[PDB]
A paper describes a structure:
In the Foc1Mfs1 structure, the Zn2+ ion is absent from the macrodomain, while the structural Zn2+ ion coordinated within the small subdomain of the [name] domain is still present. This absence leads to increased flexibility and distortion of the Zn-loop within the crystal structure as indicated by the loss of density information for the region (residues Asn133 to Ile147). The Zn-loop appears to be partially stabilized by contacts with the 3α-bundle. In particular, the contacts made by Asn46 seem to contribute to the overall stability of the Zn-loop and the exchange of this residue to cysteine (Cys61 in Foc1Mfs1) within the [name] branch may contribute for the absence of the Zn2+ ion from the Foc1Mfs1 macrodomain structure. We therefore created macrodomain only construct (Foc1MOD; aa 1–305) and compared its zinc-binding ability to SauMacro. In line with our structural observation, the amount of zinc copurified with the WT Foc1MOD protein was reduced by approx. 75% relative to SauMacro. Surprisingly, neither MorMacro, which arises from a minimal operon containing only the Zn-Macro/[name] pair, nor Zn-Macros derived from Msf1 fusion proteins could demodify SpyGcvH-L. In contrast, all Zn-Macros could demodify Glu-/Asp-ADP-ribosylated PARP1 E988Q. Identifying the physiological substrates for example, for the [name] fusion protein would not only elucidate their substrate specificity in terms of attachment residue and sequential context but also reveal how these proteins contribute to the oxidative stress response of pathogenic fungi.
Residue numbers in the entry: 8 to 30, 37 to 132, 148 to 201, 205 to 243, 249 to 302, 308 to 342, 361 to 597
The structure:
């Protein structure tokens, strides 16, 4: 057998033929040698352009549902029972309903009886095709359309939630009293429906409400006041938790004002994160491979730092270096580095059995205290300048002293260097200089050769001492996958289970090879590196 992903994908391509739409052939055969992430994107495309027309058969829907679920478990997951309330509605001595505020992706809440949907995109992608077919049937069978304030209940299918509440709010162009009342009816309709649904097996019952072009401050207070009174007036309610789920920071603020501070917490992690944590705690050695995504998580951010290496319309060399010196300075003094400040002390517990190899050397490893003897930078770094004609191997120089000596002489409004004697020129051919990073055929890799030698010696020793090596790959994109990503996959493949890979990043390039995940050798954590790292390493 091929994998479940390969099997399922070929039947959906096949379905797109025999009775498909027209929105070709080759992918079906070469599939087995295509990249996992690419194939999941194709599978999701096949489903998005599915004519709902002939029902997919049961066994195929089961496979689709398994895949969506397995992929969604790579996200950082939040169980309902981990949240902390901002308000408690006390039901005499009968019990209580907790009211929470939570910013995030509603499909990544776990242990949640019901979630809400307006009228679409994320919930349908994640629930799978069964949701479209149940909404279609239930809408036909009721015959009428949804009025503002009404709700349609479906199963959650491939979602972690048991049920979905699909509701229509009012629409405006200035909110009238009828529209205020329509929005409140939505919340009431949701809670009344939810009262009648079964509980989870532990007796809890929970709903995540999304924000339902209505003024956000007023919508938010109708939501909180409506839910609050309804719970006050239903002391016998079987409802135990209501989550106001915001996405934007402004909504979270509107809601936080109305609701108040979060209560005091009174581990049990989940998803690929728990597995990654196991691996990290059993490791005898750790390699960190990092790309630009790690520093982007700290606030330093399609482009290949176009400003420095691409942009080529400088009014003069004084402007060019004024900008370059200001940039090197700002990076060198970056004050917000909490992810580095958590990762580095954790790596130090490994002594000589930890190593850092980075393709986007902005210098933040060294500046948060990682030693250069356990560091590699094969695409170069901001630590050096070089001759732009690359006239000889020695035509490089440390950048830091030149940055420092130049900064007092740069007009901050125009970023113009006001002393031309500070323009760096090749001390041998006198040509222009650049930052010594791979950004063109002129790159000189000679100042990083010692780093390369340290990496070869370290790998060699760690692999031969048969150690349980974990590769934590942080924020590596897809521009040059041969530098870190493919060699990491390779070590995993060659090393007979002694090497495992945890890839962490945002977006779908965070995925690892399906077959290595199946063997328990590789997993990934898709989300913000700044969020994942404290969770992996606590
Ligand atoms: K479900
Ligand atoms: Zn030169």
């Amino acid at each position: 057998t091929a994998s479940v992903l390969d099997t399922t994908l070929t039947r959906l391509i096949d379905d797109v033929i025999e009775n498909g739409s027209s929105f070709l052939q080759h992918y079906k055969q070469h599939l087995s040698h295509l990249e996992t992430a690419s194939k999941i994107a194709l599978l999701r495309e096949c489903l998005c352009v599915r004519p709902p027309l002939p029902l997919l058969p049961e066994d195929l829907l089961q496979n689709v549902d398994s895949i969506l679920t397995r992929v969604r478990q790579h996200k950082i997951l939040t169980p309902i029972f981990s949240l902390s309330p901002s308000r408690l509605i006390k039901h005499g001595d009968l019990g209580a309903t907790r009211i929470h505020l939570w910013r995030g992706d509603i499909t990544t809440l776990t242990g949640v009886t019901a979630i809400t949907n307006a009228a679409d995109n994320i919930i349908h992608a994640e629930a799978g095709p069964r949701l479209r077919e149940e909404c279609f049937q239930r809408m036909q069978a009721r015959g009428k359309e949804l009025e503002p304030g009404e709700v349609l209940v479906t199963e959650g299918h491939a979602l972690f939630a048991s049920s979905v509440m699909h509701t229509v709010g009012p629409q405006l162009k200035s909110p009238t009293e009828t529209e205020r009342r329509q929005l409140a009816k939505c919340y009431e309709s949701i809670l009344e429906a939810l009262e009648l649904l079964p509980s989870d097996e532990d007796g809890s019952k929970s709903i995540a409400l999304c924000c339902i072009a209505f003024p956000a401050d007023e919508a938010a207070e109708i939501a909180v006041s409506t839910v609050t009174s309804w719970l006050q007036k239903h002391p016998s309610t079987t409802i135990t938790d209501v989550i106001f789920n915001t996405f934007t920071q402004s909504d979270t603020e509107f809601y936080s004002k109305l609701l108040g501070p979060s209560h005091t917490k009174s581990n049990t992690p989940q998803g690929s994160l728990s597995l990654a944590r196991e691996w990290l705690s059993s490791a005898d050695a750790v390699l960190v491979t990092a790309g630009a995504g790690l520093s982007a998580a700290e606030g330093l951010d399609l482009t290949s730092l176009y400003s420095v290496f691409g942009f080529n319309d400088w009014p003069s060399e004084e402007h060019r270096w004024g900008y370059f010196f200001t940039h090197l300075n700002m990076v060198a003094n970056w004050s917000n580095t909490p992810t580095y400040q958590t990762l580095i002390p954790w790596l130090r517990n490994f002594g000589q059995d930890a190593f850092v190899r980075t393709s986007a050397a902005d210098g933040l490893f060294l500046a948060n205290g990682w030693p250069k003897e356990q560091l590699s930078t094969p695409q170069g770094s901001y630590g050096y300048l070089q001759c732009l004609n690359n006239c000889r191997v020695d035509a490089v120089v440390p950048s830091a002293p030149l940055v420092a000596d130049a900064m007092p002489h740069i007009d901050k409004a125009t970023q113009k260097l006001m002393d031309p004697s500070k323009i760096p020129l090749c001390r041998f051919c006198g040509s222009k200089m650049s930052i010594c990073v791979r950004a063109g055929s002129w790159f000189n890799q000679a100042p990083y050769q010692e780093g390369e030698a340290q990496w070869k010696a370290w790998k060699s020793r760690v692999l031969r001492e048969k150690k349980n090596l974990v590769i934590l790959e942080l924020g590596v994109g897809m521009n040059t996958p041969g530098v870190l990503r493919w060699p990491n996959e390779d070590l995993v493949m060659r090393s007979d289970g002694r090497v495992k890979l945890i890839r962490v990043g945002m977006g779908p390039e965070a995925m690892v090879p399906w077959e290595q995940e199946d063997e328990g050798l590789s997993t990934c954590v898709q989300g913000d590196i700044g969020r994942a790292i404290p969770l992996l390493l606590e």
